Design an enzyme around this catalytic site. Sequence first.
Site, PDB file in Angstrom:
ATOM      1  N   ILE A  34       0.657  -1.430   0.148  1.00  0.00           N
ATOM      2  CA  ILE A  34       0.213   0.036   0.104  1.00  0.00           C
ATOM      3  C   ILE A  34       0.853   1.032   0.003  1.00  0.00           C
ATOM      4  O   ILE A  34       1.927   1.198   0.890  1.00  0.00           O
ATOM      5  CB  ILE A  34      -0.403   0.256   0.968  1.00  0.00           C
ATOM      6  CG1 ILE A  34      -2.017  -1.016   0.999  1.00  0.00           C
ATOM      7  CG2 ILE A  34      -1.286   1.474   1.751  1.00  0.00           C
ATOM      8  CD1 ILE A  34      -2.588  -2.097   1.474  1.00  0.00           C
ATOM      9  N   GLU A  40      -2.179  -9.179   2.643  1.00  0.00           N
ATOM     10  CA  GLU A  40      -1.801 -10.167   2.788  1.00  0.00           C
ATOM     11  C   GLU A  40      -2.476 -11.725   2.815  1.00  0.00           C
ATOM     12  O   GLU A  40      -2.066 -12.501   2.466  1.00  0.00           O
ATOM     13  CB  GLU A  40      -1.665 -10.265   4.926  1.00  0.00           C
ATOM     14  CG  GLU A  40      -0.739  -9.489   4.964  1.00  0.00           C
ATOM     15  CD  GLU A  40       0.359  -9.317   4.828  1.00  0.00           C
ATOM     16  OE1 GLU A  40       0.922 -10.383   3.346  1.00  0.00           O
ATOM     17  OE2 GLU A  40       1.834  -8.874   5.614  1.00  0.00           O
ATOM     18  N   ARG A  51      -1.688 -12.904  -0.950  1.00  0.00           N
ATOM     19  CA  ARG A  51      -0.806 -13.474  -0.764  1.00  0.00           C
ATOM     20  C   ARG A  51      -0.892 -14.368  -0.421  1.00  0.00           C
ATOM     21  O   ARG A  51       0.041 -15.591  -0.630  1.00  0.00           O
ATOM     22  CB  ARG A  51       0.735 -12.210  -0.049  1.00  0.00           C
ATOM     23  CG  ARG A  51       0.757 -11.686  -0.690  1.00  0.00           C
ATOM     24  CD  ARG A  51       1.311 -10.650   0.314  1.00  0.00           C
ATOM     25  NE  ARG A  51       2.354  -9.468   0.051  1.00  0.00           N
ATOM     26  CZ  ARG A  51       2.270  -8.402   0.810  1.00  0.00           C
ATOM     27  NH1 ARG A  51       2.324  -8.402   1.921  1.00  0.00           N
ATOM     28  NH2 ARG A  51       2.892  -7.545   0.614  1.00  0.00           N
TER      29      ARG A  51
HETATM   30  C1  LIG Z   1       2.221  -5.450   4.675  1.00  0.00           C
HETATM   31  N1  LIG Z   1       3.518  -4.476   4.351  1.00  0.00           N
HETATM   32  C2  LIG Z   1       4.921  -4.979   4.481  1.00  0.00           C
HETATM   33  N2  LIG Z   1       5.794  -3.522   4.685  1.00  0.00           N
HETATM   34  C3  LIG Z   1       5.019  -2.788   3.680  1.00  0.00           C
HETATM   35  N3  LIG Z   1       5.112  -1.421   3.823  1.00  0.00           N
HETATM   36  C4  LIG Z   1       4.446  -0.615   2.713  1.00  0.00           C
HETATM   37  N4  LIG Z   1       4.239   0.123   2.112  1.00  0.00           N
HETATM   38  N5  LIG Z   1       2.953  -1.406   1.973  1.00  0.00           N
HETATM   39  C5  LIG Z   1       2.900  -2.409   2.592  1.00  0.00           C
HETATM   40  O1  LIG Z   1       1.493  -3.071   2.241  1.00  0.00           O
HETATM   41  C6  LIG Z   1       3.389  -3.467   3.904  1.00  0.00           C
END
Ligand SMILES: Cn1cnc2nc(N)[nH]c(=O)c21
Length: 246
Positions: free
Chosen positions: A71, A160, A163
């Site tokens: 995101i 998540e 995935r």
């Molecule tokens: C799941 N996840 C782990 N690091 C992340 N970093 C960002 N920017 N967005 C995410 O959805 C994310």
Amino acid sequence: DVSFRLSGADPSSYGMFIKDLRNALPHTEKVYNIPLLLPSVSGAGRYLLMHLFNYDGNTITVAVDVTNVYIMGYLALTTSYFFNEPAADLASQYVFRSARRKITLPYSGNYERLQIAAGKPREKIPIGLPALDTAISTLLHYDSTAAAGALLVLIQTTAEAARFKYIEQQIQERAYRDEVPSSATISLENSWSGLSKQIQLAQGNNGVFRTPTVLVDSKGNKVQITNVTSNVVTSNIQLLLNTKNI
Ligand SMILES: Cn1cnc2nc(N)[nH]c(=O)c21
Ligand SMILES: *[C@@H]1O[C@H](CO)[C@@H](O[C@@H]2O[C@H](CO)[C@@H](O)[C@H](O)[C@H]2NC(C)=O)[C@H](O)[C@H]1NC(C)=O
């Protein structure tokens, strides 16, 4: 791009939204029957827009990076919110440009930072479709502390679940009642990278992982994954992070 409406949503429509989300991601090849995400992509083509409607019908549009499913930021009415990190800032140049105001959140988007800003670890934050509907609600009106919590819910109930089929199932079980995530769910979330690399390192190695991946399981028992014969690989993980990005 993809859409999901929490109003009149049940385990089935959710499943369909997650499926659309997986299919919205480009990939050229598969590795052990699995979509491998692209190394990189240039321009606005690198971003997927999710339109989410809470029960009352209000919406927020979320930008996802199609090479890793992260995101980047989201738009709420006429204000855009982006994470405080290099990628998100680069992303701000191709999406939500007609936004009247752009706000940078006081933290990057990784779980670690998000849990600090939220004051709670995600083991203690209940997720589910009801939680998603409230998350949407909390994001329509700025509040960095509340947004941190809302984003932890939003990432999990979307990225998540995209995935891991197991996590998608965890959310379908939580369609009318929220519940903190299980240990399996959290270690899975934490292993996406490791697993992604190992599965790829196995295609020139007879499907045998170079180095084993340890996970906590359905019950709470430590468990080693050593080859692509495991359930996780045969019927759980659905997308692979290209090693180029690891
Ligand atoms: C799941 N996840 C782990 N690091 C992340 N970093 C960002 N920017 N967005 C995410 O959805 C994310
Ligand atoms: C691949 O990994 C599996 C585990 O997923 C190994 O499984 C062996 O046999 C069963 C599962 O089929 C387990 O109870 C055992 O613990 C494993 N056997 C032993 C003797 O430890 C499997 O051996 C691995 N190797 C290959 C080449 O597939």
